[PDB]
Amino acid sequence: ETFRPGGGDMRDNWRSELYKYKVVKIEPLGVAPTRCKRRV
Amino acid sequence: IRSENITNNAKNILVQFNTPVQINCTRPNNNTRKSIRIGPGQAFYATG
Amino acid sequence: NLWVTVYYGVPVWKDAETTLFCASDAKAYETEKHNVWATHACVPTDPNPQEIHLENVTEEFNMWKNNMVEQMHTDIISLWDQSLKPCVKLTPLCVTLQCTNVTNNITDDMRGELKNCSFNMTTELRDKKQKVYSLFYRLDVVQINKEYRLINCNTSACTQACPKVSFEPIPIHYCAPAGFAILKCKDKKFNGTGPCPSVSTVQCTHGIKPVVSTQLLLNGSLAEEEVMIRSENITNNAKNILVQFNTPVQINCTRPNNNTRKSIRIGPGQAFYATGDIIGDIRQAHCNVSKATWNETLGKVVKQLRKHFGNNTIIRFANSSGGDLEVTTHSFNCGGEFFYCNTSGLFNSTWISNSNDSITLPCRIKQIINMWQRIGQCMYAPPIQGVIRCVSNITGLILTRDGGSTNSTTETFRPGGGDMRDNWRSELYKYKVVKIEPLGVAPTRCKRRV
Amino acid sequence: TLQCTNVTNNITDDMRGELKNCSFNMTTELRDKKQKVYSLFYRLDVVQ
Amino acid sequence: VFLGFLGAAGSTMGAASMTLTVQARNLLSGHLLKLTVWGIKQLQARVLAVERYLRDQQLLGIWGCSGKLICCTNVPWNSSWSNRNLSEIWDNMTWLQWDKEISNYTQIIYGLLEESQNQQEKNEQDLLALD
Amino acid sequence: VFLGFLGAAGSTMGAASMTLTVQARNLLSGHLLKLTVWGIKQLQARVLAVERYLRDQQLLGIWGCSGKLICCTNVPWNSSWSNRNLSEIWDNMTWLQWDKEISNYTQIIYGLLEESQNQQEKNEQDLLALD
Amino acid sequence: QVQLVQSGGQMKKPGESMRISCRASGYEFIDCTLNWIRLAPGKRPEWMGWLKPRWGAVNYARPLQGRVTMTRQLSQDPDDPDWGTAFLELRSLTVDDTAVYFCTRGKNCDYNWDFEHWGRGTPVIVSSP
Amino acid sequence: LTQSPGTLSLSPGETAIISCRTSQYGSLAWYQQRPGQAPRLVIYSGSTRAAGIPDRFSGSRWGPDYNLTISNLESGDFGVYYCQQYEFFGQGTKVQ
């Protein structure tokens, strides 16, 4: 296999530094079953 | 070695070292930047 | 045994800084005169400011470390710059002029002040060339080799001010945003810094006139009951001295010529206005001030300047020491043309510790102004036609003392306007912007039920 | 329209004609006179 | 008895605690590039005024003081912050002199309130749970 | 016992339900055209962060959970969504595995809460009306 | 950094003027002031006068009123705005003006009188024979 | 301003005091000129040492009086010393 260099894109440089990262959004609501019975 | 798919050919192959090889990129000339008035208040710098 | 208890909305503030926004009155916006301080895109003000007078509160004020004058000086520049982008560059004017002296009707003091420059110029079509002539002052032409050239053509181009806009200062107001508050010192003996024991919060400050001047603050707001002297430190020399009168001396700044504004086509759809001829005779533009109320007003300041230096020093005045033309002379824009007036007749006295003659100040008029000392800007003021004359107050006055003599029996005060924000700091000294901190805990006797 | 020529002041044979001494008319600060200047452009910046 | 905005700034703390409504209601209110000069000065002021108000309302939300002004909590007054009478705190001073007095003990208190609430809601949910 | 932001993401659901304060407090925080390059990226982020927070606070407002974190409601757990023990839901799993489990039954629940509140406020207003 | 590259020493005669230079470079020149101090060999140091380089507003010392004059010359290059020179000229020299002339500058330019940065000196010797 | 002692002839290691009797309320500052160079700032605002000072220098103010007590005299310290208010310099004290 004869490997040759080539830099045909300009974003392959920065993808070698933003590979550890990923951006996620917090979804803070959440329901769950437990034992509550409301008073009123 | 990173790749989106190592068997594909259109996909690049990103290698990432652990020790950095050093590069010494130089230019031996001693050129003189010389200003040139082009119009009012606009300069153009050229190797004299 | 006492218990923590929150309280939302207590009157508790802190010293802060923010971006205060504009405000202006009604008919200064609906007339649509396209003022250079564009209050037509600004917020219209309230019908009346709710000047709430607080009680029992002594706020620590300071007029020298204020931040409203750093924010006004940025907004005046960005209004004087943004209102020049839709105007025409005078880049086809940098040609080789061929000037000569005008001797139609010339008095010997205005002997060679204005030259009759006649130059080739590109027409509306991009291949023919007309031959025009004009009238430039000697402060706008330098010599080349008689062939002349403009004073700017080796340092920048020049947007001509569009004659639709006008440099007359409409009063603008500064309002705090939501959550902030502006505190106005209603004291009368507040000198520069300290507890002003009569505070009064204000949603929107009064009409601040964005006028620019040097050595003589014009159309200001007058301190009542006295003539006051402000300084950041009266013993320092680098710090200015801002005087503020109680009675305004009157100034009559006129120009006797009757010049004809003449349009010139430069390229397509871009005009360049130039003085064609002077109708009648040519004389020097002067400024009047009555000496009976001026020498009285200098007699008020010396009586108030002898509090900081002693009641026996020979207070002396003198005319400006050095600098270029914007600091060594009184500089203003009366009605759209820039006067550089020589104030060596005013500041010449000596007080040794014990009527219609009307002192005249001869002025020179320039057109290639700079006005902010920014390398790369210039604004060829278009010539206004007819005689031009305005009548104005002189409320403030800037002084700098000088040097050291090891002998405190005399101090020779000289005028000088080395900064452009000392004018506006003589109108934003009462104000300070604070942010409300509405939360607050306090101990009382609450015990929660559940 | 530039008028270039080869520089041979001190030239090694690998950088033989890589840089040319281009001398061209140019508008001055005034919009009716014209100066005559010169410069040094590489061969990757000039076509014939 | 309508003073106005900040009108009881130098008044008594026992009487400035009765005019909290007006300082709570004044914490949010309301040829081409000249619209953008005053616009970005106005738009940066309106968004900052909102999220400053929402911060002090959320911070008040997690203490058991969701929609109140005079809300009182569980944690007692630690006397190391101040040892004064209730008459020497409430009906003689002013709120500006009071804020300089306990400016060092704010974040001590603001962590004491959040822990007394999360203890409270986990004990309320187990009190009606047995229900 | 201060974990930090998202610090109990892989912890137990019975112990991530005791650190809801820190993830609730981190949902809003805080030569000419170069101010406009970073500015419109910052101003579009601050306004979006506010109205995203106000949406989840308004949606929490119409269930009877106005200013609470652990709020519990009237509608019972429909066992078709899940049939598990309370020990197999609370003190062994994590919240990320739980959200994938009932991701199909969110909007079924979020309509069940709004109708149990509008039934509740119309019955509360007729209970104290006879008053 | 702040560099005050001064001029070279001169050897005048009684009656002639002088003109010494001072080139300030490294900081923004058109904001912070300058100064001009001379150090006699056997006398006090003597301050002579500042120069706010925007508009060149000067203020000379009262024993040198009407003798010293101080100009400036800004940089009209839009590429390099933060440099500029400053000149001095002392007419009607005497034997008493034998000193070394420094062009100082404040520490931070909100207070002037902390002369941190100085110049290398311009030793002017005025002798009668 | 007035500096008291005039000359100080000491052996390297001793302590040396210099007192600048001021007159009006100004922030004093001290200068040190070795022969053959430009002076430099050592103390400003009365007490604060300048940037790059080996802390062998010390300023102390009692009203209309200031001191400069150098702790241990070294080789390159035997110059002359000026105190500087607003624009007024001292008589100069040559330590040697």
Ligand SMILES: *[C@@H]1O[C@H](CO)[C@@H](O[C@@H]2O[C@H](CO)[C@@H](O[C@@H]3O[C@H](CO[C@H]4O[C@H](CO[C@H]5O[C@H](CO)[C@@H](O)[C@H](O)[C@@H]5O)[C@@H](O)[C@H](O[C@H]5O[C@H](CO)[C@@H](O)[C@H](O)[C@@H]5O)[C@@H]4O)[C@@H](O)[C@H](O[C@H]4O[C@H](CO)[C@@H](O)[C@H](O)[C@@H]4O[C@H]4O[C@H](CO)[C@@H](O)[C@H](O)[C@@H]4O)[C@@H]3O)[C@H](O)[C@H]2NC(C)=O)[C@H](O)[C@H]1NC(C)=O
């Ligand atoms: C331009 O800017 C400059 C520079 O900023 C300004 O200069 C400053 O001007 C102010 C004017 O108010 C001066 O403040 C006054 O300074 C004197 C001197 O302080 C020194 O002496 C203190 C005690 O020494 C005693 O004995 C000597 C004799 O040797 C007397 O001369 C003294 O008066 C005393 O009796 C000593 O303690 C001081 O050190 C401390 O304080 C100074 C600031 O003063 C600090 O920098 C130090 O770090 C240190 O903390 C110092 O050595 C003070 O005596 C004056 O204080 C009096 O009043 C104070 C309240 O205003 C009070 O708190 C003091 O205790 C003291 O009280 C006296 O007066 C009272 C009146 O009610 C009496 O009741 C009381 O019993 C007592 O009699 C005051 O501090 C600054 O020093 C001066 N700064 C400098 C650098 O020179 C200049 O004014 C500006 N110009 C303008 C117009 O803007």
Ligand SMILES: *[C@@H]1O[C@H](CO)[C@@H](O[C@@H]2O[C@H](CO)[C@@H](O[C@@H]3O[C@H](CO[C@H]4O[C@H](CO)[C@@H](O)[C@H](O)[C@@H]4O)[C@@H](O)[C@H](O[C@H]4O[C@H](CO)[C@@H](O)[C@H](O)[C@@H]4O[C@H]4O[C@H](CO)[C@@H](O)[C@H](O)[C@@H]4O)[C@@H]3O)[C@H](O)[C@H]2NC(C)=O)[C@H](O)[C@H]1NC(C)=O
């Ligand atoms: C400090 O404070 C003083 C006091 O306010 C202030 O004085 C003012 O001076 C200015 C400059 O002269 C005055 O503004 C002008 O006044 C002249 C004369 O106006 C009188 O007569 C007219 C008749 O119509 C009345 O309407 C007016 O109210 C006065 O009684 C006017 O002729 C000026 O109008 C021209 O310039 C305007 C600039 O805004 C244009 O908008 C306007 O359309 C006019 O220009 C055009 O028409 C001209 C005629 O055809 C033409 O030749 C031009 O080329 C152009 O097309 C203007 O109103 C101001 O009123 C004075 N205020 C008072 C009460 O005295 C100082 O200026 C001030 N600042 C300083 C000096 O620092």
Ligand SMILES: *[C@@H]1O[C@H](CO)[C@@H](O[C@@H]2O[C@H](CO)[C@@H](O[C@@H]3O[C@H](CO[C@H]4O[C@H](CO)[C@@H](O)[C@H](O)[C@@H]4O)[C@@H](O)[C@H](O)[C@@H]3O)[C@H](O)[C@H]2NC(C)=O)[C@H](O)[C@H]1NC(C)=O
């Ligand atoms: C744009 O054009 C301007 C005018 O053509 C240029 O101004 C000139 O710049 C040169 C140097 O760049 C100056 O020359 C020297 O002048 C100084 C100061 O002195 C002379 O004039 C004053 C009176 O103003 C007089 O008092 C002095 O004694 C000098 O005779 C001398 O110290 C030098 O030794 C040298 O002679 C010109 O003085 C100056 N002319 C003016 C009218 O200011 C400007 O530089 C050009 N800008 C650009 C970017 O090229």
Ligand SMILES: *[C@@H]1O[C@H](CO)[C@@H](O[C@@H]2O[C@H](CO)[C@@H](O[C@@H]3O[C@H](CO)[C@@H](O)[C@H](O)[C@@H]3O)[C@H](O)[C@H]2NC(C)=O)[C@H](O)[C@H]1NC(C)=O
């Ligand atoms: C600002 O105004 C002052 C006075 O109002 C100007 O000072 C005067 O300048 C003139 C020349 O421009 C001096 O005149 C000469 O007059 C003497 C008579 O004293 C004569 O013998 C000479 O042959 C020469 O013609 C005049 O003396 C002088 N005034 C004083 C009191 O000395 C000043 O020049 C003005 N500023 C500017 C920048 O022009």
Ligand SMILES: *[C@@H]1O[C@H](CO)[C@@H](O[C@@H]2O[C@H](CO)[C@@H](O)[C@H](O)[C@H]2NC(C)=O)[C@H](O)[C@H]1NC(C)=O
């Ligand atoms: C306007 O332009 C014309 C032509 O460019 C100038 O005319 C000539 O001036 C040069 C000066 O070197 C003479 O050598 C020619 O003989 C002139 N030719 C003619 C037909 O006159 C004219 O001088 C320019 N006008 C001004 C005021 O500069």
Ligand SMILES: *[C@@H]1O[C@H](CO)[C@@H](O[C@@H]2O[C@H](CO)[C@@H](O)[C@H](O)[C@H]2NC(C)=O)[C@H](O)[C@H]1NC(C)=O
């Ligand atoms: C400046 O201008 C004003 C008005 O333009 C002049 O005032 C007139 O002065 C006379 C004095 O004899 C008064 O009787 C008039 O009432 C004034 N007004 C008018 C409209 O005529 C003043 O004389 C001028 N000169 C100065 C102040 O030196």
Ligand SMILES: *[C@@H]1O[C@H](CO)[C@@H](O[C@@H]2O[C@H](CO)[C@@H](O)[C@H](O)[C@H]2NC(C)=O)[C@H](O)[C@H]1NC(C)=O
């Ligand atoms: C200074 O300017 C002001 C306005 O810019 C002139 O004032 C009004 O002048 C009249 C005439 O006396 C007074 O009755 C008004 O009270 C003034 N207005 C205000 C708001 O007070 C003033 O006359 C000018 N000064 C001189 C000496 O003419």
Ligand SMILES: *[C@@H]1O[C@H](CO)[C@@H](O[C@@H]2O[C@H](CO)[C@@H](O)[C@H](O)[C@H]2NC(C)=O)[C@H](O)[C@H]1NC(C)=O
């Ligand atoms: C700069 O411009 C001048 C005039 O435009 C050029 O001079 C002429 O060149 C033409 C070329 O066709 C000749 O026919 C003329 O005889 C020349 N006249 C003179 C007076 O020399 C000049 O060649 C230009 N310079 C460059 C480097 O192109």
Ligand SMILES: *[C@@H]1O[C@H](CO)[C@@H](O)[C@H](O)[C@H]1NC(C)=O
């Ligand atoms: C380049 O030339 C300049 C001017 O002759 C000189 O000062 C500099 O030292 C030269 N540089 C080298 C590396 O020779």
Ligand SMILES: *[C@@H]1O[C@H](CO)[C@@H](O)[C@H](O)[C@H]1NC(C)=O
């Ligand atoms: C100015 O010059 C033009 C052309 O020479 C002439 O027609 C006009 O009369 C002159 N005007 C003056 C004021 O000299």
Ligand SMILES: *[C@@H]1O[C@H](CO)[C@@H](O)[C@H](O)[C@H]1NC(C)=O
């Ligand atoms: C034109 O005026 C200037 C200055 O007023 C003068 O120096 C020049 O000699 C005058 N021209 C002629 C031809 O007299």
Ligand SMILES: *[C@@H]1O[C@H](CO)[C@@H](O)[C@H](O)[C@H]1NC(C)=O
């Ligand atoms: C203003 O005056 C008061 C006394 O009336 C004085 O104490 C204060 O120092 C003065 N302000 C300044 C800046 O000197």
Ligand SMILES: *[C@@H]1O[C@H](CO)[C@@H](O)[C@H](O)[C@H]1NC(C)=O
């Ligand atoms: C100026 O000239 C024009 C045209 O001749 C005339 O209408 C006007 O009255 C003149 N102005 C004066 C003040 O003479």
Ligand SMILES: *[C@@H]1O[C@H](CO)[C@@H](O)[C@H](O)[C@H]1NC(C)=O
């Ligand atoms: C100003 O002073 C001049 C000087 O002679 C005088 O002629 C004139 O009448 C005065 N007043 C005005 C309004 O110009």
Ligand SMILES: *[C@@H]1O[C@H](CO)[C@@H](O)[C@H](O)[C@H]1NC(C)=O
């Ligand atoms: C100025 O006024 C004072 C008194 O106020 C008087 O003694 C003096 O003579 C006046 N000077 C002039 C030039 O009128």
Ligand SMILES: *[C@@H]1O[C@H](CO)[C@@H](O)[C@H](O)[C@H]1NC(C)=O
């Ligand atoms: C100076 O004398 C005046 C006379 O009017 C007096 O009011 C003032 O108090 C005196 N000041 C001093 C420091 O003696």
